[PDB]
PDB file of N, CA and C and ligand atoms in Angstrom:
ATOM      1  N   UNK A   1     -19.611  13.212 -13.862  1.00  0.00           N
ATOM      2  CA  UNK A   1     -18.521  14.169 -14.177  1.00  0.00           C
ATOM      3  C   UNK A   1     -17.758  13.688 -15.398  1.00  0.00           C
ATOM      4  N   UNK A   2     -16.700  14.410 -15.749  1.00  0.00           N
ATOM      5  CA  UNK A   2     -15.792  13.930 -16.774  1.00  0.00           C
ATOM      6  C   UNK A   2     -14.756  13.007 -16.145  1.00  0.00           C
ATOM      7  N   UNK A   3     -14.111  12.221 -16.998  1.00  0.00           N
ATOM      8  CA  UNK A   3     -13.146  11.232 -16.536  1.00  0.00           C
ATOM      9  C   UNK A   3     -11.953  11.912 -15.866  1.00  0.00           C
ATOM     10  N   UNK A   4     -11.530  13.048 -16.395  1.00  0.00           N
ATOM     11  CA  UNK A   4     -10.354  13.726 -15.896  1.00  0.00           C
ATOM     12  C   UNK A   4     -10.600  14.277 -14.499  1.00  0.00           C
ATOM     13  N   UNK A   5     -11.767  14.841 -14.254  1.00  0.00           N
ATOM     14  CA  UNK A   5     -12.084  15.391 -12.939  1.00  0.00           C
ATOM     15  C   UNK A   5     -12.193  14.284 -11.895  1.00  0.00           C
ATOM     16  N   UNK A   6     -12.853  13.186 -12.254  1.00  0.00           N
ATOM     17  CA  UNK A   6     -12.966  12.054 -11.334  1.00  0.00           C
ATOM     18  C   UNK A   6     -11.598  11.467 -11.006  1.00  0.00           C
ATOM     19  N   UNK A   7     -10.713  11.411 -11.990  1.00  0.00           N
ATOM     20  CA  UNK A   7      -9.359  10.936 -11.739  1.00  0.00           C
ATOM     21  C   UNK A   7      -8.628  11.895 -10.784  1.00  0.00           C
ATOM     22  N   UNK A   8      -8.773  13.200 -11.020  1.00  0.00           N
ATOM     23  CA  UNK A   8      -8.207  14.217 -10.136  1.00  0.00           C
ATOM     24  C   UNK A   8      -8.697  14.044  -8.698  1.00  0.00           C
ATOM     25  N   UNK A   9     -10.006  13.879  -8.510  1.00  0.00           N
ATOM     26  CA  UNK A   9     -10.534  13.713  -7.155  1.00  0.00           C
ATOM     27  C   UNK A   9     -10.028  12.426  -6.515  1.00  0.00           C
ATOM     28  N   UNK A  10      -9.967  11.347  -7.292  1.00  0.00           N
ATOM     29  CA  UNK A  10      -9.445  10.079  -6.794  1.00  0.00           C
ATOM     30  C   UNK A  10      -7.993  10.242  -6.339  1.00  0.00           C
ATOM     31  N   UNK A  11      -7.192  10.951  -7.124  1.00  0.00           N
ATOM     32  CA  UNK A  11      -5.787  11.114  -6.772  1.00  0.00           C
ATOM     33  C   UNK A  11      -5.599  12.038  -5.575  1.00  0.00           C
ATOM     34  N   UNK A  12      -6.422  13.074  -5.465  1.00  0.00           N
ATOM     35  CA  UNK A  12      -6.338  13.953  -4.303  1.00  0.00           C
ATOM     36  C   UNK A  12      -6.726  13.212  -3.021  1.00  0.00           C
ATOM     37  N   UNK A  13      -7.726  12.339  -3.128  1.00  0.00           N
ATOM     38  CA  UNK A  13      -8.147  11.514  -2.007  1.00  0.00           C
ATOM     39  C   UNK A  13      -7.028  10.579  -1.568  1.00  0.00           C
ATOM     40  N   UNK A  14      -6.325   9.984  -2.531  1.00  0.00           N
ATOM     41  CA  UNK A  14      -5.245   9.054  -2.202  1.00  0.00           C
ATOM     42  C   UNK A  14      -4.071   9.782  -1.576  1.00  0.00           C
ATOM     43  N   UNK A  15      -3.732  10.953  -2.104  1.00  0.00           N
ATOM     44  CA  UNK A  15      -2.662  11.737  -1.510  1.00  0.00           C
ATOM     45  C   UNK A  15      -2.969  12.051  -0.050  1.00  0.00           C
ATOM     46  N   UNK A  16      -4.195  12.482   0.225  1.00  0.00           N
ATOM     47  CA  UNK A  16      -4.569  12.845   1.579  1.00  0.00           C
ATOM     48  C   UNK A  16      -4.571  11.641   2.507  1.00  0.00           C
ATOM     49  N   UNK A  17      -4.883  10.465   1.972  1.00  0.00           N
ATOM     50  CA  UNK A  17      -4.964   9.265   2.796  1.00  0.00           C
ATOM     51  C   UNK A  17      -3.669   9.021   3.574  1.00  0.00           C
ATOM     52  N   UNK A  18      -2.525   9.223   2.942  1.00  0.00           N
ATOM     53  CA  UNK A  18      -1.267   8.890   3.583  1.00  0.00           C
ATOM     54  C   UNK A  18      -0.902   9.858   4.713  1.00  0.00           C
ATOM     55  N   UNK A  19      -1.566  11.010   4.782  1.00  0.00           N
ATOM     56  CA  UNK A  19      -1.433  11.926   5.914  1.00  0.00           C
ATOM     57  C   UNK A  19      -2.434  11.641   7.029  1.00  0.00           C
ATOM     58  N   UNK A  20      -3.368  10.709   6.826  1.00  0.00           N
ATOM     59  CA  UNK A  20      -4.514  10.559   7.710  1.00  0.00           C
ATOM     60  C   UNK A  20      -4.160   9.858   9.009  1.00  0.00           C
ATOM     61  N   UNK A  21      -4.945  10.173  10.041  1.00  0.00           N
ATOM     62  CA  UNK A  21      -4.762   9.536  11.340  1.00  0.00           C
ATOM     63  C   UNK A  21      -4.962   8.031  11.240  1.00  0.00           C
ATOM     64  N   UNK A  22      -5.928   7.594  10.427  1.00  0.00           N
ATOM     65  CA  UNK A  22      -6.228   6.178  10.332  1.00  0.00           C
ATOM     66  C   UNK A  22      -5.076   5.420   9.664  1.00  0.00           C
ATOM     67  N   UNK A  23      -4.492   5.983   8.604  1.00  0.00           N
ATOM     68  CA  UNK A  23      -3.338   5.334   7.987  1.00  0.00           C
ATOM     69  C   UNK A  23      -2.152   5.265   8.955  1.00  0.00           C
ATOM     70  N   UNK A  24      -1.856   6.375   9.637  1.00  0.00           N
ATOM     71  CA  UNK A  24      -0.719   6.392  10.564  1.00  0.00           C
ATOM     72  C   UNK A  24      -0.829   5.253  11.592  1.00  0.00           C
ATOM     73  N   UNK A  25      -2.014   5.108  12.174  1.00  0.00           N
ATOM     74  CA  UNK A  25      -2.301   4.046  13.141  1.00  0.00           C
ATOM     75  C   UNK A  25      -2.195   2.627  12.511  1.00  0.00           C
ATOM     76  N   UNK A  26      -2.821   2.464  11.351  1.00  0.00           N
ATOM     77  CA  UNK A  26      -2.896   1.143  10.719  1.00  0.00           C
ATOM     78  C   UNK A  26      -1.522   0.681  10.239  1.00  0.00           C
ATOM     79  N   UNK A  27      -0.748   1.590   9.667  1.00  0.00           N
ATOM     80  CA  UNK A  27       0.619   1.277   9.270  1.00  0.00           C
ATOM     81  C   UNK A  27       1.404   0.687  10.443  1.00  0.00           C
ATOM     82  N   UNK A  28       1.303   1.332  11.605  1.00  0.00           N
ATOM     83  CA  UNK A  28       1.991   0.841  12.800  1.00  0.00           C
ATOM     84  C   UNK A  28       1.461  -0.514  13.249  1.00  0.00           C
ATOM     85  N   UNK A  29       0.142  -0.704  13.191  1.00  0.00           N
ATOM     86  CA  UNK A  29      -0.447  -1.992  13.563  1.00  0.00           C
ATOM     87  C   UNK A  29       0.081  -3.118  12.671  1.00  0.00           C
ATOM     88  N   UNK A  30       0.216  -2.856  11.365  1.00  0.00           N
ATOM     89  CA  UNK A  30       0.703  -3.871  10.438  1.00  0.00           C
ATOM     90  C   UNK A  30       2.179  -4.180  10.682  1.00  0.00           C
ATOM     91  N   UNK A  31       3.001  -3.146  10.832  1.00  0.00           N
ATOM     92  CA  UNK A  31       4.408  -3.373  11.121  1.00  0.00           C
ATOM     93  C   UNK A  31       4.581  -4.151  12.419  1.00  0.00           C
ATOM     94  N   UNK A  32       3.817  -3.790  13.421  1.00  0.00           N
ATOM     95  CA  UNK A  32       3.918  -4.485  14.693  1.00  0.00           C
ATOM     96  C   UNK A  32       3.525  -5.960  14.578  1.00  0.00           C
ATOM     97  N   UNK A  33       2.431  -6.199  13.883  1.00  0.00           N
ATOM     98  CA  UNK A  33       1.945  -7.560  13.686  1.00  0.00           C
ATOM     99  C   UNK A  33       2.980  -8.398  12.943  1.00  0.00           C
ATOM    100  N   UNK A  34       3.663  -7.768  12.003  1.00  0.00           N
ATOM    101  CA  UNK A  34       4.666  -8.431  11.200  1.00  0.00           C
ATOM    102  C   UNK A  34       6.044  -8.460  11.865  1.00  0.00           C
ATOM    103  N   UNK A  35       6.172  -7.921  13.073  1.00  0.00           N
ATOM    104  CA  UNK A  35       7.461  -7.787  13.755  1.00  0.00           C
ATOM    105  C   UNK A  35       8.517  -7.098  12.886  1.00  0.00           C
ATOM    106  N   UNK A  36       8.064  -6.139  12.085  1.00  0.00           N
ATOM    107  CA  UNK A  36       8.929  -5.325  11.240  1.00  0.00           C
ATOM    108  C   UNK A  36       9.749  -6.171  10.274  1.00  0.00           C
ATOM    109  N   UNK A  37       9.202  -7.313   9.851  1.00  0.00           N
ATOM    110  CA  UNK A  37       9.868  -8.173   8.873  1.00  0.00           C
ATOM    111  C   UNK A  37       9.166  -8.093   7.525  1.00  0.00           C
ATOM    112  N   UNK A  38       9.958  -8.089   6.451  1.00  0.00           N
ATOM    113  CA  UNK A  38       9.408  -8.108   5.100  1.00  0.00           C
ATOM    114  C   UNK A  38       8.685  -9.428   4.870  1.00  0.00           C
ATOM    115  N   UNK A  39       7.418  -9.344   4.476  1.00  0.00           N
ATOM    116  CA  UNK A  39       6.588 -10.524   4.327  1.00  0.00           C
ATOM    117  C   UNK A  39       6.904 -11.317   3.071  1.00  0.00           C
ATOM    118  N   UNK A  40       7.337 -10.653   2.008  1.00  0.00           N
ATOM    119  CA  UNK A  40       7.717 -11.385   0.798  1.00  0.00           C
ATOM    120  C   UNK A  40       9.020 -12.126   1.039  1.00  0.00           C
ATOM    121  N   UNK A  41       9.989 -11.463   1.668  1.00  0.00           N
ATOM    122  CA  UNK A  41      11.226 -12.142   2.046  1.00  0.00           C
ATOM    123  C   UNK A  41      10.941 -13.366   2.918  1.00  0.00           C
ATOM    124  N   UNK A  42      10.048 -13.223   3.890  1.00  0.00           N
ATOM    125  CA  UNK A  42       9.757 -14.337   4.794  1.00  0.00           C
ATOM    126  C   UNK A  42       9.239 -15.546   4.014  1.00  0.00           C
ATOM    127  N   UNK A  43       8.375 -15.306   3.033  1.00  0.00           N
ATOM    128  CA  UNK A  43       7.857 -16.377   2.171  1.00  0.00           C
ATOM    129  C   UNK A  43       8.968 -17.041   1.369  1.00  0.00           C
ATOM    130  N   UNK A  44      10.033 -16.295   1.083  1.00  0.00           N
ATOM    131  CA  UNK A  44      11.201 -16.797   0.375  1.00  0.00           C
ATOM    132  C   UNK A  44      12.304 -17.290   1.320  1.00  0.00           C
ATOM    133  N   UNK A  45      11.975 -17.470   2.599  1.00  0.00           N
ATOM    134  CA  UNK A  45      12.919 -17.937   3.619  1.00  0.00           C
ATOM    135  C   UNK A  45      14.103 -16.999   3.799  1.00  0.00           C
ATOM    136  N   UNK A  46      13.802 -15.711   3.869  1.00  0.00           N
ATOM    137  CA  UNK A  46      14.785 -14.686   4.122  1.00  0.00           C
ATOM    138  C   UNK A  46      14.315 -13.716   5.186  1.00  0.00           C
ATOM    139  N   UNK A  47      15.246 -13.217   5.967  1.00  0.00           N
ATOM    140  CA  UNK A  47      14.951 -12.273   7.036  1.00  0.00           C
ATOM    141  C   UNK A  47      15.457 -10.905   6.600  1.00  0.00           C
ATOM    142  N   UNK A  48      14.530  -9.968   6.410  1.00  0.00           N
ATOM    143  CA  UNK A  48      14.861  -8.613   5.986  1.00  0.00           C
ATOM    144  C   UNK A  48      13.953  -7.649   6.704  1.00  0.00           C
ATOM    145  N   UNK A  49      14.522  -6.577   7.254  1.00  0.00           N
ATOM    146  CA  UNK A  49      13.722  -5.553   7.916  1.00  0.00           C
ATOM    147  C   UNK A  49      12.821  -4.848   6.904  1.00  0.00           C
ATOM    148  N   UNK A  50      11.561  -4.692   7.275  1.00  0.00           N
ATOM    149  CA  UNK A  50      10.623  -3.953   6.459  1.00  0.00           C
ATOM    150  C   UNK A  50      10.824  -2.456   6.648  1.00  0.00           C
ATOM    151  N   UNK A  51      10.651  -1.706   5.558  1.00  0.00           N
ATOM    152  CA  UNK A  51      10.793  -0.249   5.560  1.00  0.00           C
ATOM    153  C   UNK A  51       9.522   0.472   5.128  1.00  0.00           C
ATOM    154  N   UNK A  52       8.495  -0.248   4.687  1.00  0.00           N
ATOM    155  CA  UNK A  52       7.300   0.385   4.149  1.00  0.00           C
ATOM    156  C   UNK A  52       6.148  -0.596   4.280  1.00  0.00           C
ATOM    157  N   UNK A  53       4.926  -0.071   4.356  1.00  0.00           N
ATOM    158  CA  UNK A  53       3.716  -0.896   4.324  1.00  0.00           C
ATOM    159  C   UNK A  53       3.013  -0.588   3.014  1.00  0.00           C
ATOM    160  N   UNK A  54       2.783  -1.620   2.200  1.00  0.00           N
ATOM    161  CA  UNK A  54       2.216  -1.443   0.867  1.00  0.00           C
ATOM    162  C   UNK A  54       0.845  -2.107   0.766  1.00  0.00           C
ATOM    163  N   UNK A  55      -0.041  -1.481   0.001  1.00  0.00           N
ATOM    164  CA  UNK A  55      -1.334  -2.062  -0.346  1.00  0.00           C
ATOM    165  C   UNK A  55      -1.150  -3.166  -1.387  1.00  0.00           C
ATOM    166  N   UNK A  56      -1.752  -4.322  -1.134  1.00  0.00           N
ATOM    167  CA  UNK A  56      -1.626  -5.456  -2.053  1.00  0.00           C
ATOM    168  C   UNK A  56      -2.347  -5.132  -3.346  1.00  0.00           C
ATOM    169  N   UNK A  57      -3.651  -4.924  -3.259  1.00  0.00           N
ATOM    170  CA  UNK A  57      -4.384  -4.240  -4.311  1.00  0.00           C
ATOM    171  C   UNK A  57      -4.153  -2.748  -4.120  1.00  0.00           C
ATOM    172  N   UNK A  58      -3.571  -2.064  -5.111  1.00  0.00           N
ATOM    173  CA  UNK A  58      -3.188  -0.674  -4.895  1.00  0.00           C
ATOM    174  C   UNK A  58      -4.335   0.199  -4.431  1.00  0.00           C
ATOM    175  N   UNK A  59      -3.982   1.175  -3.606  1.00  0.00           N
ATOM    176  CA  UNK A  59      -4.928   2.147  -3.108  1.00  0.00           C
ATOM    177  C   UNK A  59      -5.754   2.772  -4.222  1.00  0.00           C
ATOM    178  N   UNK A  60      -5.091   3.105  -5.327  1.00  0.00           N
ATOM    179  CA  UNK A  60      -5.748   3.735  -6.463  1.00  0.00           C
ATOM    180  C   UNK A  60      -6.589   2.761  -7.311  1.00  0.00           C
ATOM    181  N   UNK A  61      -6.531   1.465  -7.011  1.00  0.00           N
ATOM    182  CA  UNK A  61      -7.343   0.440  -7.679  1.00  0.00           C
ATOM    183  C   UNK A  61      -8.587   0.049  -6.860  1.00  0.00           C
ATOM    184  N   UNK A  62      -8.484   0.034  -5.528  1.00  0.00           N
ATOM    185  CA  UNK A  62      -9.630  -0.324  -4.684  1.00  0.00           C
ATOM    186  C   UNK A  62      -9.593   0.504  -3.404  1.00  0.00           C
ATOM    187  N   UNK A  63     -10.263   1.651  -3.443  1.00  0.00           N
ATOM    188  CA  UNK A  63     -10.326   2.546  -2.294  1.00  0.00           C
ATOM    189  C   UNK A  63     -10.962   1.862  -1.082  1.00  0.00           C
ATOM    190  N   UNK A  64     -11.903   0.953  -1.321  1.00  0.00           N
ATOM    191  CA  UNK A  64     -12.627   0.317  -0.225  1.00  0.00           C
ATOM    192  C   UNK A  64     -11.735  -0.533   0.672  1.00  0.00           C
ATOM    193  N   UNK A  65     -10.575  -0.951   0.170  1.00  0.00           N
ATOM    194  CA  UNK A  65      -9.683  -1.838   0.920  1.00  0.00           C
ATOM    195  C   UNK A  65      -8.495  -1.083   1.513  1.00  0.00           C
ATOM    196  N   UNK A  66      -8.597   0.244   1.571  1.00  0.00           N
ATOM    197  CA  UNK A  66      -7.486   1.099   1.990  1.00  0.00           C
ATOM    198  C   UNK A  66      -6.974   0.823   3.402  1.00  0.00           C
ATOM    199  N   UNK A  67      -7.832   0.348   4.306  1.00  0.00           N
ATOM    200  CA  UNK A  67      -7.423   0.117   5.687  1.00  0.00           C
ATOM    201  C   UNK A  67      -7.553  -1.344   6.103  1.00  0.00           C
ATOM    202  N   UNK A  68      -7.747  -2.241   5.133  1.00  0.00           N
ATOM    203  CA  UNK A  68      -7.895  -3.663   5.422  1.00  0.00           C
ATOM    204  C   UNK A  68      -6.522  -4.263   5.684  1.00  0.00           C
ATOM    205  N   UNK A  69      -6.325  -4.835   6.866  1.00  0.00           N
ATOM    206  CA  UNK A  69      -5.006  -5.389   7.166  1.00  0.00           C
ATOM    207  C   UNK A  69      -4.630  -6.548   6.246  1.00  0.00           C
ATOM    208  N   UNK A  70      -5.607  -7.329   5.787  1.00  0.00           N
ATOM    209  CA  UNK A  70      -5.308  -8.387   4.820  1.00  0.00           C
ATOM    210  C   UNK A  70      -5.109  -7.867   3.399  1.00  0.00           C
ATOM    211  N   UNK A  71      -5.115  -6.545   3.229  1.00  0.00           N
ATOM    212  CA  UNK A  71      -4.715  -5.902   1.988  1.00  0.00           C
ATOM    213  C   UNK A  71      -3.410  -5.124   2.168  1.00  0.00           C
ATOM    214  N   UNK A  72      -2.677  -5.392   3.246  1.00  0.00           N
ATOM    215  CA  UNK A  72      -1.472  -4.630   3.580  1.00  0.00           C
ATOM    216  C   UNK A  72      -0.333  -5.575   3.908  1.00  0.00           C
ATOM    217  N   UNK A  73       0.874  -5.259   3.436  1.00  0.00           N
ATOM    218  CA  UNK A  73       2.052  -6.060   3.734  1.00  0.00           C
ATOM    219  C   UNK A  73       3.231  -5.155   4.074  1.00  0.00           C
ATOM    220  N   UNK A  74       3.967  -5.532   5.114  1.00  0.00           N
ATOM    221  CA  UNK A  74       5.255  -4.916   5.408  1.00  0.00           C
ATOM    222  C   UNK A  74       6.286  -5.448   4.415  1.00  0.00           C
ATOM    223  N   UNK A  75       7.010  -4.541   3.760  1.00  0.00           N
ATOM    224  CA  UNK A  75       7.981  -4.916   2.741  1.00  0.00           C
ATOM    225  C   UNK A  75       9.311  -4.200   2.939  1.00  0.00           C
ATOM    226  N   UNK A  76      10.387  -4.867   2.533  1.00  0.00           N
ATOM    227  CA  UNK A  76      11.673  -4.213   2.350  1.00  0.00           C
ATOM    228  C   UNK A  76      11.674  -3.427   1.038  1.00  0.00           C
ATOM    229  N   UNK A  77      12.712  -2.620   0.822  1.00  0.00           N
ATOM    230  CA  UNK A  77      12.763  -1.811  -0.395  1.00  0.00           C
ATOM    231  C   UNK A  77      12.817  -2.674  -1.649  1.00  0.00           C
ATOM    232  N   UNK A  78      13.632  -3.725  -1.641  1.00  0.00           N
ATOM    233  CA  UNK A  78      13.758  -4.548  -2.825  1.00  0.00           C
ATOM    234  C   UNK A  78      12.403  -5.144  -3.206  1.00  0.00           C
ATOM    235  N   UNK A  79      11.651  -5.621  -2.216  1.00  0.00           N
ATOM    236  CA  UNK A  79      10.349  -6.208  -2.510  1.00  0.00           C
ATOM    237  C   UNK A  79       9.317  -5.156  -2.884  1.00  0.00           C
ATOM    238  N   UNK A  80       9.385  -3.968  -2.287  1.00  0.00           N
ATOM    239  CA  UNK A  80       8.525  -2.874  -2.705  1.00  0.00           C
ATOM    240  C   UNK A  80       8.797  -2.476  -4.158  1.00  0.00           C
ATOM    241  N   UNK A  81      10.075  -2.353  -4.519  1.00  0.00           N
ATOM    242  CA  UNK A  81      10.424  -1.990  -5.895  1.00  0.00           C
ATOM    243  C   UNK A  81       9.975  -3.077  -6.869  1.00  0.00           C
ATOM    244  N   UNK A  82      10.175  -4.342  -6.505  1.00  0.00           N
ATOM    245  CA  UNK A  82       9.715  -5.448  -7.338  1.00  0.00           C
ATOM    246  C   UNK A  82       8.202  -5.395  -7.523  1.00  0.00           C
ATOM    247  N   UNK A  83       7.468  -5.196  -6.428  1.00  0.00           N
ATOM    248  CA  UNK A  83       6.020  -5.124  -6.531  1.00  0.00           C
ATOM    249  C   UNK A  83       5.563  -3.941  -7.390  1.00  0.00           C
ATOM    250  N   UNK A  84       6.230  -2.799  -7.267  1.00  0.00           N
ATOM    251  CA  UNK A  84       5.856  -1.634  -8.064  1.00  0.00           C
ATOM    252  C   UNK A  84       5.960  -1.959  -9.557  1.00  0.00           C
ATOM    253  N   UNK A  85       7.022  -2.643  -9.955  1.00  0.00           N
ATOM    254  CA  UNK A  85       7.186  -3.014 -11.366  1.00  0.00           C
ATOM    255  C   UNK A  85       6.117  -4.007 -11.806  1.00  0.00           C
ATOM    256  N   UNK A  86       5.829  -4.991 -10.961  1.00  0.00           N
ATOM    257  CA  UNK A  86       4.775  -5.948 -11.257  1.00  0.00           C
ATOM    258  C   UNK A  86       3.419  -5.279 -11.405  1.00  0.00           C
ATOM    259  N   UNK A  87       3.132  -4.289 -10.563  1.00  0.00           N
ATOM    260  CA  UNK A  87       1.821  -3.666 -10.601  1.00  0.00           C
ATOM    261  C   UNK A  87       1.640  -2.841 -11.855  1.00  0.00           C
ATOM    262  N   UNK A  88       2.742  -2.362 -12.426  1.00  0.00           N
ATOM    263  CA  UNK A  88       2.661  -1.647 -13.704  1.00  0.00           C
ATOM    264  C   UNK A  88       2.181  -2.569 -14.827  1.00  0.00           C
ATOM    265  N   UNK A  89       2.585  -3.841 -14.815  1.00  0.00           N
ATOM    266  CA  UNK A  89       2.059  -4.783 -15.813  1.00  0.00           C
ATOM    267  C   UNK A  89       0.573  -5.023 -15.652  1.00  0.00           C
ATOM    268  N   UNK A  90       0.099  -4.970 -14.414  1.00  0.00           N
ATOM    269  CA  UNK A  90      -1.295  -5.211 -14.098  1.00  0.00           C
ATOM    270  C   UNK A  90      -2.167  -4.021 -14.461  1.00  0.00           C
ATOM    271  N   UNK A  91      -1.708  -2.824 -14.109  1.00  0.00           N
ATOM    272  CA  UNK A  91      -2.542  -1.623 -14.155  1.00  0.00           C
ATOM    273  C   UNK A  91      -2.055  -0.516 -15.074  1.00  0.00           C
ATOM    274  N   UNK A  92      -0.837  -0.600 -15.530  1.00  0.00           N
ATOM    275  CA  UNK A  92      -0.185   0.526 -16.171  1.00  0.00           C
ATOM    276  C   UNK A  92       0.759   1.180 -15.170  1.00  0.00           C
TER     277      UNK A  92
HETATM  278 MN1   MN B   1      11.759  -8.306   1.029  1.00  0.00          MN
END
């Protein structure tokens, strides 16, 4: 195909993923395993409630790792925002 169409299909697939039964289940499994604590904060010796589960390697970078628990981290907002900025340096 053309690059634009493949990008469109990739993005539509990623959008749908977050509505999926498998994501809903896996998100809960990760939060539960993490006791709803931000994992980056914990590494920095801080206790902060997690509000989101983020892909370490972004979903749009490696579709194959979309449901891998070792590719998922519970994060607080500050750490999610920090990671989002960092990932822009990596990927755009
Ligand atoms: Mn944090």
